[PDB]
Amino acid sequence: STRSISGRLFYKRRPLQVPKLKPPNIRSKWLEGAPQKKGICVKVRVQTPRKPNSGLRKVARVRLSTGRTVLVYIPGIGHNLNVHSVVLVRGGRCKDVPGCNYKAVRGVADLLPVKNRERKRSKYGVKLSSEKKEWRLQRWNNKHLTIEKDRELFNQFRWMTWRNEEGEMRTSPLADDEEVPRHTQLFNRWYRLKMQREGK
Amino acid sequence: QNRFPVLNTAENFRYWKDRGLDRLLPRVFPLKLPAHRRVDPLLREYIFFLHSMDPARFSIRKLGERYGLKERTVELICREFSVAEFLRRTELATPYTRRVSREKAVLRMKEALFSLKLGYDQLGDEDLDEQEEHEFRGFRSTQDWIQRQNIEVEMMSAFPLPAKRNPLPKRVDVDVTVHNTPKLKVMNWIDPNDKVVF
Amino acid sequence: AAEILVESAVEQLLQVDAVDPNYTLRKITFVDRDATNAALLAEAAQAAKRAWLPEHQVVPAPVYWSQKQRRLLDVTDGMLMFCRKHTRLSFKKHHGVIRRQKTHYFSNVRPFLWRSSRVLEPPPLLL
Amino acid sequence: RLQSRRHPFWIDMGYKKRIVRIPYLYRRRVAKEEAQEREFG
């Protein structure tokens, strides 16, 4: 309808009718628009979550640099924050803990060591790739898994003319106790190219 | 209800089309292939020879009339033939081992398969010039981009009705070449919107 | 139809298709009443004159200069070592899908555009 | 049908990966079944 347009003051009545507020970014409002703000902890307690959620959740009151105090959650196993400790907070809402609308950041913060046990989430737990884990990703050699089907095929069209590796052509693949050799050009191609290249 | 025995009516438009439940039915369609490849390779050599021999007597248009080839199609035959021969005489590389995109590789397979089933064409079958005919060429053919309308509405009367407003041509800028030198290329910018020519 | 006639006249005069030249016909003329047709006919004449007489043989400028400074280059077998490649087929390995419509426009489109109209490259000059 | 969005390089690499991967999966499945019958069945 156009009922709201009537009157010579239509340019001052309609525009003054605000629909609603801004639902988004309604909780995180003490940051003054900054992505992150540093703070210092002055109280450490354990707040019991509301029903029906049982258990205990660790929380701490962190004083922001802007002279404002607000509870912050410390996700992850273990605990190292104490009285008069500097920790960097971020956005995030916690349903179990009422009122808390902030989360701490591991690693970048001060006097906050790395997580105890975690392999799946790396960035989240600010855990760097260990040397042992990196070495495991390079081991790729599990191709030798011949079966009975290959044995019959080999001794039908690939046993007359076939060059072995060391110095010999004619081998004994027909023997059951013997094992059919591997390919000298295709088998383990990706691993061979990488190992022979780094050797310089 | 009405009589109109012709092949340009609303129902007759786009004949042999799925209108109903048959749209989702899978149907095989013929594979298209360019005309310059369906011709006999033998004739291509012959055509090329003539062109390269005497361009005056054997012009681009006259040569294509005898064999029934378009002016654009005949040009590609000489160009594609030239390069193939150049690499063989000079002993550079074989045509099979030549590097080319994947779009051409699949085209070559179709050309060989086309002849293996039916055979090569001894003479081309195409018209040199176009002809104004009623055909469906895309979705932009049955639409008026000037007036931006699909349905035309007019008054019904026996007396002469006033004519409609004719459109005007669109004036756009173009460029031309005046002086060309090995170390410099001079060009002129034409502005049709300028009243003073000078 | 015009081009057919014109093109035919020239051949008769020269008697190309004749083992034994018998020069008898040395005068060919065309007469047309229609002004419109007459004008058109003239055009055909021009085209006929081209590619026949050496004094009216045009040639694009880009290829004319190349043809003048001709040289003999000797290429040995060892000079084509890097020309050969391993892969047989080739195709685009990076989609042209733009990520940022605004960031790219104000970085590689606006600076390279100095005109308010879309103009394509003009054709070469004939010499 | 939705259009492709992945890089061509990745697309092409996926086919190469399957050349040696695929055959191993087929042999790995029959290895357990065949061995079970030769010792129990």
Partner: peptide
């Protein structure tokens, strides 16, 4: 899966690169 890794090739057997035989225009 009964066979693990007994005979392996790391540097003992080299790999011949792909020769060049496709001239590019």
């Amino acid at each position: 899966l009964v066979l693990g890794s007994n005979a392996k090739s790391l540097v003992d057997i080299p790999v011949r690169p792909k020769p060049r035989r496709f001239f590019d225009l």
